[PDB]
RNA sequence: UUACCGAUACCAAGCCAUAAAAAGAAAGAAAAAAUUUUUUUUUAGAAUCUUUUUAUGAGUAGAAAAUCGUGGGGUUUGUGUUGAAGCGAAAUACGUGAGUUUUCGUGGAACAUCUCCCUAGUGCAGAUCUUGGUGGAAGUAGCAACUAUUCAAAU
RNA sequence: AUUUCACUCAUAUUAAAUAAAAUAACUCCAAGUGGGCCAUUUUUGGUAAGCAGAACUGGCGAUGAGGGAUGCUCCUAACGC
RNA sequence: CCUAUUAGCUGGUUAUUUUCGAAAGAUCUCUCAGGAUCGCUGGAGUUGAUUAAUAUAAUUUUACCAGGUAGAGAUAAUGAU
RNA sequence: AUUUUAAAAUUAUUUGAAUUUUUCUUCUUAUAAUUUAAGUUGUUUCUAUACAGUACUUUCUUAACCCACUCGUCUUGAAACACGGACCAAGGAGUCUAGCAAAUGUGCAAGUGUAUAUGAUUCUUUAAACAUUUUAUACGCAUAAUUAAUGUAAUAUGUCCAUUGUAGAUUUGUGGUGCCCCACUUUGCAUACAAUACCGGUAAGCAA
RNA sequence: UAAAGCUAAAUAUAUGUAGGAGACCGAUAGCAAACAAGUACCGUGAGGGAAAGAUGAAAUAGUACUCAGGAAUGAGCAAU
């Protein structure tokens, strides 16, 4: 015998392969695995990892937030591993160069009308092999509604979690345990 | 009940099996209805079967 | 008991019979894993039936070879045995059970022309 | 009818299964109920500092473009 | 599909995954929402705090059509126009648009966001909030009440 | 005080599997037998893939992955009066295993699909389990109330 | 108190030693369990008990192999071929 | 016939190999053969480390802190003698 | 098919210096070979000048030597003087529907889902498939919260700008050791910890 | 605009009768009943209620003749 933990074997804690079956995505995975291996650049490793993640870890990015992130980076390229969407709250748009996995129709029209362009990842592999003058960006990953129920249970003192309820009103879970007048508040 | 779920609400406490209705013929019926209102037109012989509202 | 002829080594030759299959005839000899408290075969008492395990596995380099030292491919008609003209020194053919005598004669006389061996070229004769 | 009623056999074996965890050692804590009349003044101080900093930033943005 | 169900994995085992000592008996704690306030109290308290008791006034015959009122913020107010029509109002300084939000299904104009500086606009609606009305007056516009 | 004998534990080497690692997506001739002529064998490049290195392997209740088999459906491409399915006995056969494959005999009319998918009334040693058939006990227990039968003939 | 600016505190042997220390930290969804017993040492009730009740460790349960003739708990030692 | 009424209780619960691996404590309960809830376990997924470092440790060393058990006392207090 | 190379060792000729003064004395200071390097090679015989023999492979049967209590179940504890099981064949037990959530795959995205119907040169199959009424208000969920409630409703017009700080992925410019890691410089995603402003309710102060 | 009245269509159909079809069952299955099945049989009565399909293409080929035996039945140099 011998006194090891998890005997002599090393633990890893994440996703290892694609689950999706889109042939084009499989070709992309092959390409960026090759690029990551043969030029250890830390730019292609991260991209090779990000396009393996599940849907909830590839959130969309709005046009306005993308323009805000690129304000001090003229004539550079923004790289997103998600979709980018339109934003009616903006009045005007600048000229931008953006590579993303998907664009919506309105966002694609607005970008090209200002003189910009939209890129796929196989073109970025051909023009910026090691990511020179490229900026990696992510969207908000904890803005989903499901994350509002996680954390401390609703009922523990000073929590912020939403409850699961049929509907909302004065008759739906507002009496005992949420006000001092019925025996205690939270 | 034991987990973080919503509290249950289902109204299944009477003899609910006697009156259940699966709809197998919602397109057969519309074919039948179309043929009847088309048969009416050939008997009106030129006048329409609608009325002004 | 280890058996070895050339480079092929077999780590055991006897079957793993099911526990209690020699005493009750409603119990068939095909191996089933014993579950249930107080077994004496699940608990590895000495003197009873052994259990199979991955340790008896065969060498990857000699895992499916026959004593002929070739792999076996089973054919049903003439057109299926044409991919063997490129790899005739590593494969041998065997004719399926449900083909008629007339079909068998042709399969055999083509295998002879291709210089591939036939495992059961004596049946229905 | 009678049974056991207390022991803590096995308890710290389970406790040390996933180690003894420590607090997370953050940098800032919340001054919610803490000493009043001293942190309101601190708010005033930081407002003055921020006003000065942003006035300088605006000024520089004004000259640099001429 | 019955092909991928978890029960097929336990087909040779005795207890079907429910344990030797504590079996799978039928309703060992009650039916439905039975034991709450007695022996299900902790689950109720930590997952649904304010469940017991009543509060408020009764409304005997509601008629929800009387208080239907969808809203729109001043953020989304220039976005209702097409981009080409949004464009010419920037160059020309003599003309402003007049927008009727009740033709789009909105009833009350609400005041979150920012309007473009010195870009006048005229808005029609049934209700306005104070902040929204001030923000419309600031860039040189006017609010009009309809019915 | 010495020698010796003795574990599934310790040491060295082979093999199976699990975990981790070093690498690979810009391809060219090697022997032997034959008297500078012929003949054999090979001449690889599937990404959950291919080579190579190290450490490790107990398990009830419980959880997960990969794999084996059954009735029926879509696609593909097959067997059969020169004998299908099924059944009996087997095998210089393959697999750690569930199993797969084949020979002989019987049989007399249909049977597959592993190319990839869909679907379910889909896998038994037990429940004083259900229905049907069959044993040892065994040529054994037993064939005991009601007084009682005999001689000769016919058929 | 905070905000700036200037100067300066060992590091290649790491502000004492040792470390198959990142086999780490965190979030989510769920199973089984909630009758225990035993040994050395401390210890309460009882004349005592293979009795009843506690403490710290290690076991048996959930576990086979060599030894104690024999033996759920003792000694050596934990398990691919 | 309603009716396949209800059962916190007895009995049963169907192929293979490989990997990880428990609890029989605790709080509330018309609760004591039950249950919810925390603890112990599996799976999924991010963030990190891959730089013989730092985070880290059922271990020591150096500096400092808190204690009234084994012992002792009866001429020091209390209570025995 | 180009780390069974390099190096190292050995042997025989050499180019020079030591010292231990020598047929294994040292220092690859020049070429050739060899292995002790760079995980087993060779010679004879037999099977045999065979075609299934009494030999070789394989499956059954029967001995020996060592070892081996009856399975399933409840239980701290089962070979038990604990319960079920005389034998064999067929049958035999976590499924269906509603409603919610988490995880994952797919489509579109501030929107999304063509309800009931209607249309068509749809009509064995077809009870399928196809279509949508010739500055465009059916309905659900989402896009805004909070209060018993009358109700009220998210920086603010100085600038289409997008609140503040600490750590932090990626990018920009110099130098260090080997595209990587460091020391400065530039930018500052996700997220963690805090600060600030504003909206609904309640206190406090003032109040036509 | 109460204390009198009538009235098609769009809706339903575990019954009766006819027609068509299915990723349904295949003689311990499917209706209790694939057959002289609500039949045989049980109960004073209200009621209860089964088991049981297959020679061969053709019997318009269902076994002629002989021997043994009281007969059943067996055997053949004999027969579909
Ligand atoms: Mg080991
Ligand atoms: Mg074998
Ligand atoms: Mg046991
Ligand atoms: Mg198990
Ligand atoms: Mg059970
Ligand atoms: Mg000795
Ligand atoms: Mg194991
Ligand atoms: Mg079926
Ligand atoms: Mg078959
Ligand atoms: Mg079944
Ligand atoms: Mg069966
Ligand atoms: Mg059986
Ligand atoms: Mg009998
Ligand atoms: Mg007798
Ligand atoms: Mg219990
Ligand atoms: Mg042990
Ligand atoms: Mg003894
Ligand atoms: Mg019942
Ligand atoms: Mg383990
Ligand atoms: Mg019990
Ligand atoms: Mg137990
Ligand atoms: Mg007992
Ligand atoms: Mg037992
Ligand atoms: Mg006894
Ligand atoms: Mg019992
Ligand atoms: Mg019995
Ligand atoms: Mg989802
Ligand atoms: Mg609703
Ligand atoms: Mg106000
Ligand atoms: Mg006044
Ligand atoms: Mg009337
Ligand atoms: Mg039919
Ligand atoms: Mg029947």
From TrEMBL, chain A:
Composition skew (Basic residues), residue ranges: 155-169, 176-186
- What Gene3D superfamilies does this protein map onto? 3.100.10.10
Entry's SUPFAM superfamilies?
Ribosomal proteins L15p and L18e
Asked whether the keyword Ribosomal protein is assigned, the reply is yes
Which keywords has UniProt assigned to this entry?
Ribonucleoprotein, Ribosomal protein
Residue ranges annotated for the Large ribosomal subunit protein uL15/eL18 domain, each copy included: 1-186
Q: Where is this region: Disordered?
A: 143-186
Q: Report if keyword DNA-binding is assigned.
A: no
Q: Name one GO cellular component term.
A: cytosolic large ribosomal subunit
For this UniProt entry, the molecular function terms from Gene Ontology, in alphabetical order, are: RNA binding; structural constituent of ribosome
GO BP of this protein: translation
UniProt similarity note: Belongs to the eukaryotic ribosomal protein eL18 family.
Protein's name according to its UniProt entry: 60S ribosomal protein L18-2, putative
What lineage, starting at the top, does this entry show? Eukaryota, Sar, Alveolata, Apicomplexa, Aconoidasida
TrEMBL record, chain B:
Q: What family is this protein classified in? A: Belongs to the eukaryotic ribosomal protein eL13 family.
The name under which this protein is listed is 60S ribosomal protein L13
Species source reads: Plasmodium falciparum (isolate 3D7)
- Please tell me where this chain falls within the complete protein, as first and last residue plus total length: 2 to 54 of 215
Automatic annotation (TrEMBL), chain D:
Composition-biased stretches, type Basic residues, lie in: 1-30
Q: What is this protein called?
A: 60S ribosomal protein L29
Could you list the residue ranges that cross the membrane? none
Give the record's family classification: Belongs to the eukaryotic ribosomal protein eL29 family.
Q: Name one GO biological process term.
A: cytoplasmic translation
> Which species?
Plasmodium falciparum (isolate 3D7)
What InterPro entries has UniProt attached to this entry? Ribosomal_eL29
Keywords linked to the UniProt accession? Ribonucleoprotein, Ribosomal protein
Which parts of this chain are annotated as the region Disordered?
Answer: 1-35
Q: What Gene Ontology terms describe where this protein resides (cellular component)?
A: cytosolic large ribosomal subunit
List the Gene Ontology MF annotations in alphabetical order. structural constituent of ribosome
From TrEMBL, chain E:
Domain called Large ribosomal subunit protein uL15/eL18: residue spans: 71-144
Task: Fetch the InterPro entries from UniProt.
Answer: Ribosomal_uL15 (IPR030878), Ribosomal_uL15/eL18 (IPR021131), Ribosomal_uL15/eL18_sf (IPR036227), Ribosomal_uL15_CS (IPR001196)
Location of the region described as Disordered in the Swiss-Prot/TrEMBL record: 1-37
One Pfam match, by short name?
Ribosomal_L27A
Keywords noted in UniProt: Ribonucleoprotein, Ribosomal protein
Q: Where is the composition biased (Basic residues)?
A: 1-13, 20-37
Q: Which HAMAP family match?
A: Ribosomal_uL15
**Biological processes annotated in GO:** translation
Q: Which family does it belong to?
A: Belongs to the universal ribosomal protein uL15 family.
Q: What is this protein called?
A: 60S ribosomal protein L27a, putative
Which GO terms of the molecular function aspect are on file? Answer: structural constituent of ribosome
Q: Which GO terms describe its cellular component?
A: cytosolic large ribosomal subunit; large ribosomal subunit
């Amino acid at each position: 015998g011998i006194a090891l933990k998890n005997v002599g074997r090393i633990k890893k804690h994440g996703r290892k392969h694609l689950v999706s079956k889109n042939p084009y995505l499989r070709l992309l995975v092959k390409l960026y695995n090759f690029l990551a291996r043969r030029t250890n650049a830390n730019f292609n490793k991260i991209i090779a990892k990000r396009l393996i993640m599940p849907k909830r870890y590839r959130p969309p990015l709005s046009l306005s937030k993308l323009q805000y992130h690129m304000a001090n980076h003229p004539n550079d390229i923004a790289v997103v591993v998600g979709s980018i969407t339109d934003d009616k709250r903006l009045f005007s748009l600048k000229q931008l160069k953006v590579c993303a996995l998907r664009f919506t129709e309105t966002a694609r029209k607005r970008i090209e009308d200002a003189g910009g362009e939209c890129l796929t990842f196989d073109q970025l592999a051909l023009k910026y092999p090691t990511g020179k003058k490229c900026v990696l960006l992510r969207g908000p990953t904890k803005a989903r509604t499901a994350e509002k129920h996680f954390g401390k249970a609703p009922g523990k003192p000073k929590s912020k979690a939403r409850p699961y309820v049929r509907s909302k009103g004065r008759k739906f879970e507002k009496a005992r345990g949420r006000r001092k007048s019925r025996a205690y508040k939270k | 009940v034991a987990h973080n779920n919503v509290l249950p609400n289902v109204h299944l406490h009477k003899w609910w099996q006697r009156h259940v209705r699966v709809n197998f013929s919602k397109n057969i019926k519309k074919k039948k209805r179309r043929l009847l209102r088309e048969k009416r037109r050939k008997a009106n012989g030129g006048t329409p079967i609608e009325k002004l509202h | 008991a280890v058996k070895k002829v050339g480079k092929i080594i077999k780590k055991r030759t006897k079957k793993f019979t099911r526990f209690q299959s020699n005493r009750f005839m409603r119990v068939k000899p095909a191996w089933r894993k014993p579950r249930g408290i107080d077994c004496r075969v699940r608990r590895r008492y000495k003197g009873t039936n052994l259990m199979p395990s991955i340790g008896y596995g065969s060498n990857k380099k000699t895992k499916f070879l026959l004593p002929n030292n070739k792999y076996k491919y089973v054919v049903k008609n003439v057109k299926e045995m044409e991919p063997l003209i490129m790899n005739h020194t590593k494969y041998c053919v065997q004719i399926a059970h449900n083909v008629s005598s007339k079909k068998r004669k042709q399969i055999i006389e083509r295998a002879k022309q291709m210089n591939v061996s036939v495992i059961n070229a004596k049946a229905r004769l | 009818a009678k049974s056991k009623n207390h022991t803590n056999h096995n308890q710290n074996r389970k406790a040390h299964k996933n180690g003894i965890k420590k607090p997370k050692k953050h940098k800032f804590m919340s001054r919610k109920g803490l000493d009043p009349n001293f942190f309101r003044n601190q708010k005033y101080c930081l407002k003055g500092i921020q006003k000065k900093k942003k006035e300088l930033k605006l000024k520089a943005k004004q000259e640099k473009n001429n | 599909a019955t092909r991928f169900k978890k029960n097929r994995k336990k087909r040779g085992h005795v207890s079907a995954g429910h344990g030797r000592v504590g079996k799978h008996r039928k309703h060992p704690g009650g039916r439905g929402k039975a034991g709450g306030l007695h022996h299900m109290r902790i689950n109720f308290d930590k997952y649904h705090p304010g469940y017991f008791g009543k509060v408020g006034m009764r409304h005997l015959n509601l008629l929800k059509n009387r208080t239907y009122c969808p809203t729109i913020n001043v953020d989304k107010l220039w976005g209702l126009l097409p981009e080409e029509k949004k464009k010419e109002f920037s160059e020309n300084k003599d003309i402003a648009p007049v927008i009727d939000v009740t033709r789009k299904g909105y009833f009350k104009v609400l005041g979150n966001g920012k309007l473009k500086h010195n870009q006048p606009i005229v808005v029609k609606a049934r209700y306005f909030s104070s902040v929204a009305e001030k923000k419309i007056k600031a860039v040189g516009g006017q609010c009009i009440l309809v019915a």
